[PDB]
Design a binder for this molecule. Structure first.
Ligand code: K
Ligand code: K
Ligand code: K
Ligand code: K
Ligand code: K
Ligand code: K
Ligand code: K
Ligand code: K
Ligand code: K
Ligand code: K
Ligand code: K
Ligand code: K
Ligand code: K
Ligand code: K
Ligand code: K
Ligand code: K
Ligand code: K
Ligand code: K
Ligand code: K
Ligand code: MG
Ligand code: MG
Ligand code: MG
Ligand code: MG
Ligand code: MG
Ligand code: MG
Ligand code: MG
Ligand code: MG
Ligand code: MG
Ligand code: MG
Ligand code: MG
Ligand code: MG
Ligand code: MG
Ligand code: MG
Ligand code: MG
Ligand code: MG
Ligand code: MG
Ligand code: MG
Ligand code: MG
Ligand code: MG
Ligand code: MG
Ligand code: MG
Ligand code: MG
Ligand code: MG
Ligand code: MG
Ligand code: MG
Ligand code: MG
Ligand code: MG
Ligand code: MG
Ligand code: MG
Ligand code: MG
Ligand code: MG
Ligand code: MG
Ligand code: MG
Ligand code: MG
Ligand code: MG
Ligand code: MG
Ligand code: MG
Ligand code: MG
Ligand code: MG
Lengths: 101, 52, 51, 186, 41, 142, 132, 127, 147
RNA sequence: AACGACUCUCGGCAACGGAUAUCUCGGCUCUCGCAUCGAUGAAGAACGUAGCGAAAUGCGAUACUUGGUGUGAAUUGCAG
RNA sequence: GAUGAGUAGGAGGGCGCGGCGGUCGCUGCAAAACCUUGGGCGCGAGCCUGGGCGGAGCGGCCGUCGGUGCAGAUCUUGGUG
RNA sequence: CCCGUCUUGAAACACGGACCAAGGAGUCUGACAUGUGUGCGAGUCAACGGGCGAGUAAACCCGUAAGGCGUAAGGAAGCUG
RNA sequence: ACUGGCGAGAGACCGAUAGCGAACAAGUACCGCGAGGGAAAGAUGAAAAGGACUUUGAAAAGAGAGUCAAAGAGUGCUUGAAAUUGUCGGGAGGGAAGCGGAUGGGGGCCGGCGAUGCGCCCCGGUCGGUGUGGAACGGCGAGCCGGUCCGCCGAUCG
C-alpha cells in the first residue's frame, strides 16, 4: 500500500540563522580553541604542544610535499593529534556504510 | 474554527501540490550563470564585461 | 587549531575588537558577556562582599 | 482521609531558576544566590528573582527614560535587570553609573562619551553588595503588541482591545458591528 | 599587552599581540544552536 | 585554563571526552571522570582536572615502584607541554606522604585536596607493591 | 580524494562496473605483480597474466607453489596453474582457481606485443617517476 | 575489599510486575504495560487482581542499586576503564562487558587484583 | 522535531488525547469560515466585529505610489544630522544647519516632540504640519518648501 | 485410585515455519550535460535464426552474426 | 514540616528503536541476531551479566534528527491449529 | 467472572477477538496566534541576485535612496496629523 | 521550463511484506470475449572440493564412510524466532484452566554463597637514612619560602 503521510521533497530542509548569530558562534569557537582545558575536553591530544594559541612561521605555507608537511607537525608537537586520527580509521557501523559513508 | 484567531484565508483549495516550485537547483543556477558570464567575457575580449 | 603567522595577525582586522569595528565585516563588533569577570571565587571572597 | 485541597500542596508555579542555558547568566545566578542567602538583603532577593525571568518579563529601558528617572540622583547607581537601549529623542546625556545585563552598542557609546560607566552585575556586587545607594528600575512590561490584544474581546461593550486582522483598511472589520449604519456599533 | 609566541620551524619578530577575538565570550548554547541548524543546509 | 575555572566548569560539566556515564540519566545513573589530574575521578567542580588552575596528579611513573607527583603550574596555563611540575618519588611511603603534604597543603596549593591526594598516594603505592609480588591477602575481613 | 567529475565514488557503481566488465576489461583487472627479479630488469611493477606465463603462489594454502599458467578463466576471475590441483571424492583431479593478484610472475611469455607493452610501462616510470 | 555499605537492604517487593493477561495470550508479552481500559479490573484495583507498580514500592535511597555483595556495579570494557574505580573500590565493583574477548578479560582480571577491585564475573569464558 | 511532539507522549492511550465521547471527526463544524452567520455567529461577533458588510467607496486600479508620503517627527529631526555636523551647529550660533528631510526619504514633517534647546534649524520638506512649523519658528528656525 | 492410557503442564532434543540479524549488479529522490524517430518505410507486431536452446538478450536466409578499426590470446556447461 | 483516589484531559521527568555531527570503545582469543529451569539491578518503561548457538560486524556517551514503540481496527500479508 | 469498546449502566443472552510472526494510524506544508530560548535593537532581516568558495548544492562576503515588518494615527473620502 | 529520451554525478532515502508493480526469463506467469486486471519469486562454500566406495532395499532412501574450518553449510542449502507437532524426562487431574497474595514440599541455581586478618615483640634477610655539594623545577610575588633526583659526610634508626 501507500505509507502514511508520504515524504515530500518540499519539506523545509534548510535553515537561515541570522548572520549576526552565526558570527557570534564563530567567535565563541575561535575563543574556545585558545583554552587548553577545552581543547583537551574535546578529545585532542595536545600534551606536547608548546603553547596555545599555536602560531607557526609563515614558511609552513611553502611546504609542497606531504612528507615535509608531516615533519612540520612533528616539530610543533601537533603530530600526536594527527596520529590519533589515522589510528582511529574504521568502518562506519550500521546502514551508513553502504550509503557511500 | 475556534478561539480568537485571525480569519484564515489559505489559498490551498486547488491542486496546488502539482504546481510547487522547489529551489534545490538554486546553487546550480548560480554556477551555470557564472559559467555563461565567464564564457561571454572571453568571447568579447577585450571589450568590457559590463556590456554596453 | 594551528595558526600561521599571517592568519593570526589578520584576526583583529577580520573580527575587529571591543572598541573598533571589523574591517571586513561591515559594522560588526565583538559581543559582550553578561559577566565581566566569571571568577566567582574572587567576587564572593572579595573584601567588599565578605564585609 | 484529610479534608484538604490537593493534599495540602501548592498549585502555584514560579520560576526557581533561569530557563536559559547561558553560562554567564548561571554564574550570575550563583553569585546572587550566595548574596541573598548570606546577607538577607531585600535588594539581593529581588535581583535574584528577576534573573530567572523570561525575555518579555525583562523589558528594555530606553536611555531617555533612564535619564529622567536618574535626574537629581547622580550619586546613586542605576540598576536594571534587562537591556538598555539608545534613544535618539534624548539630546543631553549626563554622566551616570548604570548596571544592566546588556547595553546596546549606541547606548554604551553615548554613556561612555558623557563620562558615565556601564557596569555588569558582577561589578555591582563589588561596589554595592547590599544594593546601597542604588536606583532599581524596570522597563515597561505591557508596552508591546501582544498586550493590546489582551483583555475583554473587541466585540463586547466598553472594549478597546485590538482585534486580529490580516490587513488594515475599509474592507477589514469596519462593517456590521463597527458602526450604527451597519446593524450596530458594539 | 598579552602576546603570543610564534613557533619556528627548522631551516627558517617572534611574538604577536593576542587578538581581541580570543577574549570573546564562550557560549556553548549559542554554538550548539547555530551548528545544528546550519548543518542541515 | 586561560579563562576562569568556574566558566570552564559550566562548559565541560555537561559533555567532555573524559566524562564516563553509565545506566542512563535516571536513578541508576553513575558518572565518573577519567582525566589524569582528577584524584578521585569524580565529575565535580572540586575534583575536576579541567576547571581548576591548581590540580594534583598522582599515578605510577615508569618502573621500579616510582610514583609521579605533578602539580599544574599557575603561570603556565597556556603552555600544555610545560604545565606540569613533575616530581618522581621512589622512597618509602612515609617520605612520599610528607612530600605530598608539603606540595598540596603546606604551601596552600590545594588544601581541600590533601585528604584525596594522600588516599590517592596510598592506593597507587599499594598497587605497585602487589604488582611486584602479587596478591597475597583478599582484604575481605572486617 | 578524487576530483575528476567523470569518476564516481559510489560503491554500487564500482561493484557493477567490476562484475559486468567485458572480457577485454577483465584482462587488465586480472593483473599480477612481477617478481623482484623481473621488476629490476624491465622496471615494471604489474602485468596482466597470460596463458603461458610462469607464476609463483604467494598467498593461500598453496603458498610457495610454482608452475606454469594453463588457463585464464576470465569468466571466473581465476587462473589455473599446472600441478596446482586437488582430488575429488571420486579420485579425479581438478585444477584449483587462484586470483592473479595472489601470485607473482616469475617468467614472462614474451612476444612482439608483450615486449612493446613492457617498453610503454617502463617509459612512463623512467620519466614521470625518476626525471620528476 | 570491604564494602562500605552497612545498612541492610530491604526489598519492598521481590516479585516482578507481570503484564495483565500475558499468561493467557502468547502475543501479550510480560513487560509491564499500564492497562488503559474503561472496565479494566486491574486498573480499578479490585482485590485479587494483578498489582500495578507505583512509587510507593521505591527502595531506600541509601541501599538502592546495591548488589547482594554490598557494592554497586560499573561496567568495564578494558583495562583503562577499570582504573577509574581505584579510589572507589569499597563502593563500586566492576563487571566486564559481555562482548570482551577472553584474552582481554585476563588483563582486566589481573589488573583488578592489583587494584583490589571486585569483579562480579571474573570467571567468564576462561575455560 | 518529532521527539518533542506530544503525540509521542500519548502513545498507548487509545484516543490520542481527543476523548472517547467526542472523538476526532473530520469536519464536525464545517470547513474554514463556514457558518459565520449561523453556528459560528457568536465567535465572529465577539472577536471580529465589523467582519460582515460593505463600507466606503471603491477605487478602481488604485496605485500606491501616488499616495507615498513618509513622515518624520520633530523629535527625530535632529537625529538625521551627522554627529560631526552636530558639533558645528553648537560651535557657531550665527548660522543654522539646513536639514533637507527629502534627502533622507521623508516628505512631510510632523510636530511630535521638541527640538534641541537653543538650536535653530532650517527644515526643507515637501509638506509640514502647522504645529511642526510653529515649533521650528519658536526655536529660531525657518521652513523651506520643495518638491 | 498403584501401574498404564488420556488430558494439561514444565524441561531436553527432534519437527513445522521463514521471523530476526548481516548483506545487495535493485529502487527512490536531487542535480547536471546533450537534442538525435518516420514514405531513404518509424514505434509497434509477427515469424525465423546457434554443433548441442525453451525463455531472456542478440540478430535477419550474410540471421547469438559479416566487414573495418582498436585491443593482443582466448571462449567455456560440453563437444569439436 | 505537611501530604498521597482518579475516567476524559493537560503537563513534567525518564525508558526503548534507526540515522547524522562528535567523542570513548569492543570484535575471528568470536560482533549482530537468536535460545536458556543461569544470576542480578530498577516502583516501572527497561538495563547489566553467565552459558549456548552463530561466523562478521557492533556498542557507550553528548548533541541533533525521524517513515521511532501495538493485543484489538469483521485490520494487511504470510504461517499454523 | 474476559479483554478491548460505545454507554447513566458490561462478566453480560451488546459488538470485535481461533492462534503466531511481521507490517499497521495526529504527519508534512502555508498563514496566524500565545509562550519560551537566542541574536541585535529604533531598528531588524544576505531572503532575488552578485562576489566567491571545502577543486566547492556547504561555509564566508556584499543592501550603494532595494524591499518586508516596525518607527503615527484618525477618516468612506477630500484631508488633517 | 523539463516526473519523456540518451549520458553523468550525488544522497542524514528504502534494504526483499521495504524500495518502482517488477533486485530474478516483470509488464513476465496467470485471469478476462473485450476495454483491462496483474502476481509470487534474492543469499551453499574461499574453492563443487556437489558426497567415491561398502552394505540393506523393487525404488525413494537409510546405515557406515568420504570432501570441507564447518555438513550442527548437502543444490529453495548463511543465520533459523513464534504459533503448532512428535518424543523422552518431572509433575498434576471427582463437570474448565489460568491469575493475585502467603507459606510449604520437591527441584534447579549461587563460593563477592561466608572471614581467617590485624596490632605489638626478636631471628634473619632485603631496602632506604643530619649537615654540606650538584641537576632539573616549583609556591608566594627583586626577594623570601620549598619539594624531587644524584653524590659526599655525619647519624646510626626506620
Ligand atoms: K526548480
Ligand atoms: K487534546
Ligand atoms: K508429559
Ligand atoms: K533482514
Ligand atoms: K521495413
Ligand atoms: K566487429
Ligand atoms: K559512535
Ligand atoms: K540472559
Ligand atoms: K541518537
Ligand atoms: K463499541
Ligand atoms: K450497544
Ligand atoms: K463479544
Ligand atoms: K489564539
Ligand atoms: K529597512
Ligand atoms: K547588496
Ligand atoms: K467620516
Ligand atoms: K509487489
Ligand atoms: K552454516
Ligand atoms: K516437548
Ligand atoms: Mg543493527
Ligand atoms: Mg481539492
Ligand atoms: Mg493519607
Ligand atoms: Mg487530586
Ligand atoms: Mg442598508
Ligand atoms: Mg452596546
Ligand atoms: Mg525487582
Ligand atoms: Mg466505568
Ligand atoms: Mg554471550
Ligand atoms: Mg488518561
Ligand atoms: Mg475512540
Ligand atoms: Mg468535537
Ligand atoms: Mg481539522
Ligand atoms: Mg545474446
Ligand atoms: Mg494521585
Ligand atoms: Mg541503537
Ligand atoms: Mg521456556
Ligand atoms: Mg543502549
Ligand atoms: Mg528512515
Ligand atoms: Mg509509523
Ligand atoms: Mg499483532
Ligand atoms: Mg488497544
Ligand atoms: Mg482478524
Ligand atoms: Mg489470514
Ligand atoms: Mg485448519
Ligand atoms: Mg442502552
Ligand atoms: Mg467491558
Ligand atoms: Mg442477560
Ligand atoms: Mg456496533
Ligand atoms: Mg467473532
Ligand atoms: Mg511490529
Ligand atoms: Mg516569540
Ligand atoms: Mg526603502
Ligand atoms: Mg478634516
Ligand atoms: Mg532530461
Ligand atoms: Mg517488492
Ligand atoms: Mg526488513
Ligand atoms: Mg558468510
Ligand atoms: Mg539454514
Ligand atoms: Mg515452539
Amino acid at each position: 500500500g501507500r505509507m502514511f503521510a508520504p515524504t515530500q521533497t518540499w519539506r523545509r530542509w534548510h535553515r537561515k540563522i541570522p548572520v549576526n548569530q552565526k558570527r557570534y558562534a564563530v567567535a565563541s569557537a575561535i575563543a574556545a580553541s585558545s583554552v587548553p582545558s577545552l581543547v583537551l575536553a574535546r578529545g585532542h591530544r595536545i600534551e606536547s604542544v608548546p603553547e596555545l594559541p599555536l602560531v607557526v612561521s609563515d614558511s609552513v605555507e611553502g611546504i609542497e610535499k606531504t612528507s615535509n608537511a608531516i615533519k612540520a607537525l612533528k616539530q610543533i608537537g601537533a603530530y600526536p593529534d594527527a596520529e590519533k586520527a589515522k589510528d582511529s580509521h574504521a568502518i562506519r557501523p550500521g546502514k551508513g556504510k553502504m550509503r557511500n559513508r | 474554527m475556534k478561539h480568537n484567531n485571525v480569519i484564515p484565508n489559505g489559498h490551498f483549495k486547488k491542486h496546488w501540490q502539482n504546481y510547487v516550485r522547489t529551489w534545490f537547483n538554486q546553487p546550480a543556477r548560480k554556477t551555470r550563470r557564472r559559467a555563461a558570464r565567464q564564457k561571454k567575457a572571453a568571447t568579447i575580449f577585450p571589450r568590457p564585461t559590463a556590456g554596453s | 587549531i594551528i595558526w600561521t603567522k599571517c592568519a593570526y595577525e589578520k584576526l583583529d582586522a577580520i573580527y575587529g575588537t571591543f572598541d573598533k569595528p571589523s574591517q571586513e565585516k561591515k559594522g560588526y563588533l565583538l559581543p559582550r558577556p553578561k559577566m565581566v569577570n566569571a571568577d566567582l571565587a574572587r567576587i564572593i571572597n572579595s573584601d567588599e562582599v565578605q564585609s | 482521609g484529610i479534608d484538604l485541597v490537593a493534599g495540602g500542596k501548592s498549585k502555584k508555579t514560579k520560576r526557581t531558576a533561569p530557563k536559559s542555558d547561558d553560562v554567564y547568566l548561571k554564574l550570575l545566578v550563583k553569585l546572587y544566590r550566595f548574596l541573598a542567602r548570606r546577607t538577607g538583603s531585600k535588594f539581593n532577593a529581588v535581583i535574584l528573582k528577576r534573573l530567572f525571568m523570561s525575555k518579555i518579563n525583562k523589558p528594555p529601558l530606553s536611555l531617555s527614560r533612564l535619564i529622567t528617572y536618574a535626574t537629581g540622583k547622580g550619586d546613586n547607581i542605576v540598576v536594571l535587570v534587562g537591556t538598555v537601549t539608545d534613544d535618539v529623542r534624548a539630546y543631553e546625556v549626563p554622566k551616570i553609573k548604570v548596571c544592566a545585563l546588556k547595553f546596546t552598542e549606541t547606548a554604551r557609546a553615548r554613556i561612555e562619551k558623557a563620562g558615565g560607566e556601564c557596569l555588569t552585575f558582577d561589578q555591582l556586587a563589588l561596589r554595592a553588595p547590599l544594593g546601597q545607594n542604588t536606583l532599581l528600575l524596570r522597563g515597561p512590561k505591557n508596552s508591546r503588541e501582544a498586550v493590546k490584544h489582551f483583555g475583554p474581546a473587541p466585540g463586547v461593550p466598553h472594549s478597546h482591545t485590538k482585534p486580529y486582522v490580516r490587513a488594515k483598511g475599509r474592507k477589514f472589520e469596519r462593517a456590521r458591528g463597527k458602526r450604527n449604519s451597519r446593524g450596530y456599533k458594539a | 599587552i598579552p602576546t603570543t609566541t610564534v613557533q619556528s620551524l627548522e631551516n627558517d619578530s617572534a611574538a604577536v599581540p593576542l587578538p581581541a577575538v580570543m577574549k570573546a565570550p564562550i557560549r556553548p548554547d549559542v554554538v550548539t544552536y547555530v551548528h545544528s541548524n546550519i548543518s542541515k543546509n | 585554563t586561560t579563562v576562569p575555572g568556574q566558566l570552564v566548569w559550566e562548559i565541560v560539566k555537561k559533555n567532555n571526552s573524559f566524562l564516563v556515564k553509565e545506566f542512563g540519566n535516571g536513578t541508576a545513573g553513575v558518572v565518573f571522570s577519567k582525566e589524569p589530574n582528577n584524584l578521585y575521578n569524580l565529575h565535580s567542580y572540586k575534583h575536576s582536572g579541567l576547571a581548576n588552575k591548581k590540580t594534583v596528579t598522582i599515578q605510577p611513573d615508569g618502573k621500579d615502584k616510582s610514583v609521579l607527583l605533578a602539580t599544574s603550574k599557575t603561570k603556565k596555563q597556556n603552555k600544555p607541554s610545560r604545565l606540569l611540575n613533575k616530581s618522581v618519588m621512589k622512597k618509602e611511603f612515609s617520605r612520599m606522604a610528607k612530600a605530598v603534604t608539603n606540595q598540596v597543603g603546606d604551601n596552600y596549593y590545594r588544601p581541600d585536596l590533601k585528604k584525596a591526594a594522600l588516599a590517592r598516594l596510598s592506593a597507587v603505592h599499594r598497587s605497585l607493591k602487589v604488582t611486584k609480588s602479587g596478591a597475597k591477602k583478599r582484604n575481605r575481613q572486617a | 580524494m578524487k576530483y575528476n567529475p567523470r569518476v564516481s565514488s559510489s560503491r554500487r557503481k564500482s561493484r557493477k562496473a567490476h562484475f559486468t566488465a567485458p572480457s577485454s576489461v577483465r584482462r587488465v583487472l586480472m593483473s599480477a605483480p612481477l617478481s623482484s627479479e623481473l621488476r629490476a630488469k624491465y622496471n615494471v611493477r604489474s602485468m596482466p597474466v597470460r596463458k603461458d606465463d610462469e607464476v609463483q603462489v604467494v598467498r593461500g594454502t598453496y603458498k610457495g607453489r610454482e608452475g606454469k599458467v594453463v588457463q585464464v578463466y576470465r569468466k571466473k576471475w581465476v587462473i589455473h596453474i599446472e600441478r596446482i590441483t586437488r582430488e575429488k571424492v571420486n579420485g579425479s583431479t581438478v585444477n584449483v582457481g587462484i586470483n592473479p593478484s595472489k601470485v607473482v610472475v616469475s617468467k614472462l611469455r614474451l612476444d612482439k606485443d608483450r615486449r612493446s607493452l613492457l617498453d610503454r610501462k617502463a617509459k612512463g616510470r623512467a620519466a614521470a617517476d625518476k626525471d620528476k | 575489599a570491604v564494602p562500605l555499605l552497612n545498612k541492610k537492604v530491604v526489598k519492598k517487593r521481590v516479585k516482578r510486575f507481570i503484564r495483565p493477561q500475558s499468561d493467557r495470550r502468547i502475543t501479550v508479552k510480560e513487560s509491564w504495560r499500564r492497562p488503559k481500559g474503561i472496565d479494566s479490573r486491574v486498573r480499578r484495583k479490585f482485590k485479587g487482581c494483578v498489582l500495578m507498580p507505583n512509587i510507593g514500592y521505591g527502595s531506600d535511597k541509601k541501599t538502592r542499586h546495591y548488589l547482594p555483595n554490598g557494592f554497586k556495579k560499573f561496567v568495564v570494557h578494558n583495562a583503562s576503564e577499570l582504573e577509574i574505580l581505584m579510589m572507589h573500590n569499597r563502593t563500586y565493583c566492576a563487571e566486564i562487558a559481555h562482548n570482551v574477548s577472553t584474552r582481554k578479560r585476563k588483563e582486566i582480571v589481573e589488573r583488578a587484583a592489583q587494584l583490589d577491585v571486585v569483579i562480579t564475573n571474573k570467571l567468564a569464558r576462561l575455560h | 522535531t518529532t521527539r518533542f511532539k506530544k503525540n509521542r507522549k500519548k502513545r498507548g492511550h487509545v484516543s490520542a488525547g481527543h476523548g472517547r465521547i467526542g472523538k476526532h471527526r473530520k469536519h464536525p463544524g464545517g470547513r474554514g469560515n463556514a457558518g459565520g452567520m449561523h453556528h459560528h455567529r457568536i465567535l465572529f461577533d465577539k472577536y471580529h466585529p465589523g467582519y460582515f458588510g460593505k463600507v466606503g467607496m471603491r477605487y478602481f486600479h488604485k496605485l500606491r505610489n501616488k499616495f507615498y508620503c513618509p513622515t518624520v517627527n520633530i523629535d527625530t529631526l535632529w537625529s538625521l544630522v551627522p554627529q560631526e555636523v552636530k558639533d558645528k551647529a553648537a560651535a557657531n550660533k550665527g548660522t543654522a544647519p539646513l536639514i533637507d528631510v527629502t534627502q533622507f526619504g521623508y516628505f512631510k514633517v510632523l510636530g511630535k516632540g521638541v527640538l534641541p534647546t537653543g538650536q535653530p534649524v532650517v527644515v526643507k520638506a515637501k509638506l509640514i504640519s502647522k504645529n511642526a512649523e510653529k515649533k521650528i519658528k519658536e526655536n529660531g528656525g525657518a521652513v523651506v518648501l520643495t518638491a
